[PDB]
Structure 1
């Protein structure tokens, strides 16, 4: 994409009733909002179209 520098994105999982801590002074891509899983579903893969009436 015209850029040679990179951004390697990490992640962890914060349990309910706990915290996270960052100490830094550089090369940081900050988070604004953290996801919260809603419940149960399923992901798949396909390379075709969908149908809804079946």
Structure 2
């Protein structure tokens, strides 16, 4: 269990992953607990995650899956990461400055 408080005064965008092994033996040699979990929570966020161990097609030569999540952490809001396996914890997060006239375009110029 690890915690961060938003001391930036700006919307901290946190990204984390939840891994899903293709087999139960890999779950037991990377994370020890077969019935592992993760539980990322804030003041208004609350979600538990659980690895769905199952045999799947290889993509980038990987039968495993890797579910990427996010939430906005408000000014002064605390986030509490908790787990006993499969949590791919953030190194870095991004304190956003809102601004208008921005937007995504697809250009070959």
Q: Please indicate the TM-score interval, normalised by the length of the shorter structure.
A: 0.7 to 0.9
How far apart, in 2, do the equivalents of 1:45 and 1:36 lie? 25
| Structure 2 unpaired stretches of 5+ | 1-59
How far apart, in 2, do the equivalents of 1:10 and 1:4 lie? 20
Is residue 104 of structure 2 the alignment partner of residue 43 of structure 1? yes
Q: TM-score, normalised by structure 1?
A: 0.74
Is residue 87 of structure 2 the alignment partner of residue 28 of structure 1? yes
How far apart, in 1, do the equivalents of 2:74 and 2:96 lie? 12
Which structure shows the bigger proportion of residues in strand conformation? 2
Shift of 1:29: 0.6
Q: TM-score, normalised by structure 2?
A: 0.40
Across the aligned residues of Structure 1 and Structure 2, the Cα RMSD in angstroms comes to: 1.4
Which structure shows the bigger proportion of residues in helix conformation? 2
Shift of 1:5: 0.1
Rg larger for? 1
Total equivalences in the alignment:
48
Partner residue in 2 for 1:5? 64
